Amino acid sequence: DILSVGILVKERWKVLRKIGGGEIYDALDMLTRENVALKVESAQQPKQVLKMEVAVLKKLQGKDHVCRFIGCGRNDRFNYVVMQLQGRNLADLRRSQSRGTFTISTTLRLGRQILESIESIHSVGFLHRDIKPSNFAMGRFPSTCRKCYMLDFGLARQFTNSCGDVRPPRAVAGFRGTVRYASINAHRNREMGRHDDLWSLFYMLVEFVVGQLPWRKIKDKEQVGSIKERYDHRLMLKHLPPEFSIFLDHISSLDYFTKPDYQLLTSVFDNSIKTFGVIESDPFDWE
Numbered sequence: 001d002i003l004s005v006g007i008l009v010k011e012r013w014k015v016l017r018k019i020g021g022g023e024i025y026d027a028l029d030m031l032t033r034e035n036v037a038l039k040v041e042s043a044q045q046p047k048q049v050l051k052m053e054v055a056v057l058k059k060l061q062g063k064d065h066v067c068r069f070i071g072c073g074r075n076d077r078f079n080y081v082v083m084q085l086q087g088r089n090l091a092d093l094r095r096s097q098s099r100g101t102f103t104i105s106t107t108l109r110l111g112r113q114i115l116e117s118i119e120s121i122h123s124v125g126f127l128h129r130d131i132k133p134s135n136f137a138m139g140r141f142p143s144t145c146r147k148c149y150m151l152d153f154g155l156a157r158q159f160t161n162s163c164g165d166v167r168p169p170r171a172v173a174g175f176r177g178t179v180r181y182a183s184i185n186a187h188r189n190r191e192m193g194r195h196d197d198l199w200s201l202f203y204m205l206v207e208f209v210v211g212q213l214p215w216r217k218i219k220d221k222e223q224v225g226s227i228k229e230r231y232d233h234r235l236m237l238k239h240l241p242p243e244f245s246i247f248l249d250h251i252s253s254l255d256y257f258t259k260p261d262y263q264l265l266t267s268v269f270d271n272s273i274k275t276f277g278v279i280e281s282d283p284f285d286w287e
């Protein structure tokens with residue numbers, strides 16, 4: 001690691017506890033007397049991504065489901081960013097459930113919040129490219145703990161130009177994200193688009209309700225991609241509310257050059273939540 005518990009960054013943030021390992025700490029902000037999240041990277045790491053992370057976090061400021069930006073810096077030893085500290089991430093919350101699953105009520109509410117966050121990052125011109133449960137966390141206070149926050153913009157890519165139009169895709173793009181949640185496009189080393197973040201959301205929602213994905217045990221990235229390319233994704237509809245056939249049909253129709261119909265996808269969640277009688281104040285599974 002570059003830092004260690006106890007050290008002070010910028011005479012202000014005292015590192016207290018490592019919370020993620022990418023080196024991230026719970027730190028004391030001496031100016032506000034609050035615990036914050038501080039993420040650091042070596043100025044010698046070949047893949048340096050905190051520049052991207054700060055730029056996207058700044059672009060999302062003020063929007064829902066985004067940590068507040070607190071500060072950032074760059075020195076000869078490391079780069080760092082400081083942001084609002086959240087609570088438990090969704091991978092940990094699902095694993096803390098004795099059955100390894102969420103109910104459809106918790107799944108639909110989380111999915112709708114995650115969809116909102118994906119529409120927000122696309123609306124500022126960026127793809128997330130690593131949508132997965134450990135990159136989402138609930139708030140840690142009574143006023144935030146029912147809110148899900150999108151994390152980890154290090155692998156993001158701008159898909160618009162300086163003008164705001166969609167940029168021409170590269171012929172070949174390195175696969176950056178997580179094999180388990182990656183779309184077919186990612187596996188093919190094709191330029192990822194907005195629909196590929198939505199495919200990762202779909203896989204997350206299926207894994208929430210079922211507890212696993214079909215390729216859970218498969219570790220060869222090419223084997224996983226082969227399975228996904230041939231898989232009949234309609235089989236995943238079995239444990240989701242009926243309108244997710246509309247969700248799957250829609251994202252299947254998309255490609256790099258087609259903006260998603262976010263209103264349609266939102267309606268799938270809104271309608272399912274209403275049909276199941278789900279209300280926001282219902283306890284989440286971990287309550």
Ligand SMILES: Nc1ncnc2c1ncn2[C@@H]1O[C@H](COP(=O)(O)OP(=O)(O)O)[C@@H](O)[C@H]1O
Nearest residue numbers: 019020021022024037084085086089134151152
């Ligand atoms: N603002 C935050 N508040 C709380 N936990 C965070 C925060 N940012 C990241 N984490 C935790 O750290 C883990 C890894 O951080 P993340 O930003 O995803 O970086 P990386 O995946 O590159 O290690 C997350 O899965 C989450 O548990």
Ligand SMILES: [Mg+2]
Nearest residue numbers: 134135151152
């Ligand atoms: Mg992460």
Ligand code: NA
Nearest residue numbers: 051052054055
């Ligand atoms: Na930046």
Ligand code: NA
Nearest residue numbers: 051052054055
């Ligand atoms: Na920048």
Ligand code: NA
Nearest residue numbers: 173174175176
């Ligand atoms: Na790439």
Ligand code: NA
Nearest residue numbers: 255256257258
């Ligand atoms: Na097209």
